[PDB]
Amino acid sequence: TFLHLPCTIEAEEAEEIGVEHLLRDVRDQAAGGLSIRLTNQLKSLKGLQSK
Amino acid sequence: NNNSALSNVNSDIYFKLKKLEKEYELLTLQEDYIKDEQRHLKRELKRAQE
């Protein structure tokens, strides 16, 4: 059987440089200013609720 | 004495003032525009600093 084992995206450092280059979007979730995290807090409640 | 007409003001209101009124609607629109533009340079300001 196939058991779930924790995974996350973390990026290499050499990879990073290109990730920065190709992301030129404002980023709705990026963890910014007051504004960015009020949008998050709502998003976060509907995330959990569906789970 | 005097020389004035009242006819002229009233005419000016139907004719000429309505075309100025289209223009004041545009300054409303400008008002809206510079909210989104202010927010945008705020996003970019952060991006520059990073």
What single-letter DSSP state applies at residue B15? T
Experimental resolution (Å): 5.4
B12 neighbors B21 (Cβ within 8 angstroms): no
Which one-letter amino acid corresponds to residue A41? Answer: Q
- Residue A32, number of CB atoms within 10 A of its CB: 16
Q: Which of residues 1-40 of B touch A (CB under 8 A)?
A: none
Query: In this complex, is the C-beta atom of B46 within 8 Å of any C-beta atom belonging to chain A?
Result: yes
Q: Measured at the alpha carbon of residue B22, what is the angle toward residues B21 and B27, in degrees to the nearest 5?
A: 90
Q: Measured at the alpha carbon of residue B19, what is the angle toward residues B24 and B38, in degrees to the nearest 5?
A: 20
- Residue A37, number of CB atoms within 10 A of its CB: 14
Closest Cα to residue B38, out of A35, A42, A10?
A: A35
What letters, b where the CB count within 10 A reaches 16 and e where it falls short, cover B2-35? eeeeeeeeeeeeeeeeeeeeeeeeeeeeeeeeee
What letters, b where the CB count within 10 A reaches 16 and e where it falls short, cover A1-27? eeeeeeeeeeeeeeeeeeeeeeeeeee
